[PDB]
UniProtKB/Swiss-Prot annotation:
Substrate binds at residue 101. This is Lysozyme C. The gene is LYZ. In the egg white and polymorphonuclear leukocytes. GO terms for cellular component: cytoplasm; endoplasmic reticulum; extracellular space. GO terms for molecular function: beta-N-acetylglucosaminidase activity; identical protein binding; lysozyme activity.
Length: 129
């Protein structure tokens, strides 16, 4: 599923991401924009052989099981395929664990490089929320 901007903001808010660990909704929308272009089915292979899955490009090295990432963990206790669903629940629940891991949203390199410090509220501007 490719979400619209405000549609994803609303779904993220419904699932409790707005101000989660102190990160406003616009931060989460911005991260999803640059990780996946709002596409739940996005996948990307990393150089190390792990793969990133879904709207927030969650990595198989630590967070989900895809059966093909040697030495990896599955700390969200989910198949990586669950991160590709039109229902964002699994991605949101796993993102909550990731953002709580110690480095906040810096875990998402694209957030650090493209969202951090910017006018992230622009991402939810106009949205009925
Ligand atoms: Cl957009
Ligand atoms: Cl915001
Ligand atoms: Cl594996
Ligand atoms: Cl594990
Ligand atoms: Cl599994
Ligand atoms: Cl959803
Ligand atoms: Cl933080
Ligand atoms: Na894994």
């Amino acid at each position: 599923k490719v979400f619209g901007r405000c549609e994803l903001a609303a779904a993220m808010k419904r699932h409790g991401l707005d101000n989660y660990r102190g990160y406003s909704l616009g931060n989460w929308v911005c991260a999803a924009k640059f990780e996946s272009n709002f596409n739940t089915q996005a996948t990307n292979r990393n150089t190390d052989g792990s793969t990133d899955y879904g709207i927030l490009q969650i990595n198989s090295r630590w967070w989900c099981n895809d059966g093909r990432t040697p030495g990896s963990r599955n700390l969200c206790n989910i198949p990586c395929s669950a991160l590709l669903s039109s229902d964002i629940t699994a991605s949101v629940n796993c993102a909550k664990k990731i953002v709580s891991d110690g480095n906040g949203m810096n875990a998402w390199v694209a957030w650090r490089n493209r969202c951090k410090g910017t006018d992230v509220q622009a991402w939810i501007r106009g949205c009925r929320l």
